[PDB]
Amino acid sequence: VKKQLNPETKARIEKCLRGNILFRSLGEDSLEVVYSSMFEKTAEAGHFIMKQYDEGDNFYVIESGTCNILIQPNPDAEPVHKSTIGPGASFGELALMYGTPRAASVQAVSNVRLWALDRDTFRRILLTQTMRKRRQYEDFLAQVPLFEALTSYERMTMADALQPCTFKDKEIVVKEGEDGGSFYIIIDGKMKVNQTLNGRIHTINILGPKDFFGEMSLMFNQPCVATVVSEGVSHCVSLDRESFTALLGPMEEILQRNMQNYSAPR
Ligand SMILES: Nc1ncnc2c1ncn2[C@@H]1O[C@@H]2COP(=O)(O)O[C@H]2[C@H]1O
Ligand SMILES: Nc1ncnc2c1ncn2[C@@H]1O[C@@H]2COP(=O)(O)O[C@H]2[C@H]1O
Numbered sequence: 001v002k003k004q005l006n007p008e009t010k011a012r013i014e015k016c017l018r019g020n021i022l023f024r025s026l027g028e029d030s031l032e033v034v035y036s037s038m039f040e041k042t043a044e045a046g047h048f049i050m051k052q053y054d055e056g057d058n059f060y061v062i063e064s065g066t067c068n069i070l071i072q073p074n075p076d077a078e079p080v081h082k083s084t085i086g087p088g089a090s091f092g093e094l095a096l097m098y099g100t101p102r103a104a105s106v107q108a109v110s111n112v113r114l115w116a117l118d119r120d121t122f123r124r125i126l127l128t129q130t131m132r133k134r135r136q137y138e139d140f141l142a143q144v145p146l147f148e149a150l151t152s153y154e155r156m157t158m159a160d161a162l163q164p165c166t167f168k169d170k171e172i173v174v175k176e177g178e179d180g181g182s183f184y185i186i187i188d189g190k191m192k193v194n195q196t197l198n199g200r201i202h203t204i205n206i207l208g209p210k211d212f213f214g215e216m217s218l219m220f221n222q223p224c225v226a227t228v229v230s231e232g233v234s235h236c237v238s239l240d241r242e243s244f245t246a247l248l249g250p251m252e253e254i255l256q257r258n259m260q261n262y263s264a265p266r
Contacts, residue, residue, distance in 0.1 A: 003036065010035040016063045016115055019088050019242055021161045022126060023061075030125040038115045043108040052079070054102045056095025058116040059126070062087050065112030070105040079105055096122045097131050103153075134159045137237075144210045146185060149250045158247060162237040167230035173213075176227040180217025182238040186210065189234025194227045201227075205262075215255050218244050 013035055017023040023034065041060070043049050049060065052072055066086045070079035082104065085091065095102050096119050117126075137159040141147045150158060165184070167173060173184060176195060186209055193205035193213065204226065207213060217224045218241055239247065248255075 005032065005035045013038055013115055016061055016088065020061060020090055021243060022090055022093070022130060025129065026125060033121065033125050034117070037121045038117055041114045041116050043112045043114070045108055045111050047108050049106045049108060049112070049114070050092060050102050052102050052105045054095075056092065056099075056102060056119065058118055059090065059092045059096055059122045060106075060114045060116050061090045063113040063115055065108060065110040067091070067112060068107045068109055070107060071103070072105075084109065093122070093126070093130065097127050130160065137162060140187065144185065146210070146212055146251060146254055149254065151250070154247075154250055161239055161243040161247060163240070165236050165238050167234040167236065169230060169232050171230045173228045173230065173236075174217070174224045174226075176225065177223050179223055180214060180221075180241065182240050183212065183214045183218055183244045184228075184236045184238045185212045187235045187237060189236075190231040191228050191234060192231050194229060195225065206231075214238075215244075216259070219248070219252075219255065 017034070023031075026034065038061075041049070041058075043065075049067065052070070053075060062085060064087060066084050067089075068084055069082045069091070071082050072079045091104075091106055092102070094100060134156050138155065141150065141155045141158055147155065147158065162185075167189070173191065174181070186207055188209050191207040191211075191213065192203050193207060194201050195204050207228070213228050214224070216222065
């Protein structure tokens with residue numbers, strides 16, 4: 001004897017939550033809680049959904065409209081624009097996780113439609129695994145050159161998005177000629193980078209801890225120019241195409257510079 005979801009509201013929430021990585025991870029039982037618990041909130045253009053330093057109440061996902069993230073350096077100072085977010089983006093988790101006052105104001109730019117979880121529901125289904133994942137990858141993200149330019153909050157969202165993957169000896173990760181799927185950063189292990197020429201395979205590069213690969217197919221929407229294959233057991237984390245593209249900003253210059261190592265210059 002349990003209350004039934006409204007299948008139409010479930011479909012609507014699912015459409016909004018597609019691609020948000022915090023909800024993609026939840027298993028089916030927690031998803032049932034989300035689909036029965038989330039509620040609608042609207043905000044007119046220019047109105048604040050939350051103000052920096054407020055006590056936390058809800059966690060939000062944008063359904064329609066865009067919002068500005070504004071951060072003051074202190075309560076007596078003017079807010080600075082930091083970023084603009086839109087459909088599928090979430091905000092408001094930090095206060096609910098860490099018990100801190102809100103770290104930013106969030107202002108509707110357009111009229112906005114949101115789906116919201118209250119604090120008790122957030123604590124039940126999202127708090128534990130979100131906090132753990134961010135903690136577990138903090139040291140890694142701070143010491144990998146690829147991530148040098150990420151802000152502290154960008155590190156947290158990068159941790160949310162990264163997916164662990166394990167590769168056995170001789171296992172192919174990306175195959176020359178195939179469409180790009182994911183971007184990989186090596187935690188431990190070793191990869192051979194192999195490329196065919198006149199029907200002969202040769203090894204053109206060797207990758208190890210904190211190196212990365214798979215970016216060119218995703219950045220330029222083209223097939224992989226090489227095969228990357230594990231040499232022994234390797235542990236990586238990956239970003240899928242959608243997450244790579246969403247989070248590319250603070251990485252792009254490092255990724256572009258690094259391509260210098262792929263060919264002698266002219
Ligand atoms: N650079 C940022 N720094 C801190 N919080 C941010 C930032 N960008 C977006 N946010 C979101 O803004 C929210 C404001 O309230 P919270 O601090 O509960 O959680 C915060 C994050 O979800
Ligand atoms: N010399 C190299 N030339 C081309 N790609 C390389 C080289 N060394 C490592 N790689 C990586 O191999 C990857 C194979 O797939 P991508 O083309 O998506 O991006 C490529 C780079 O990340």
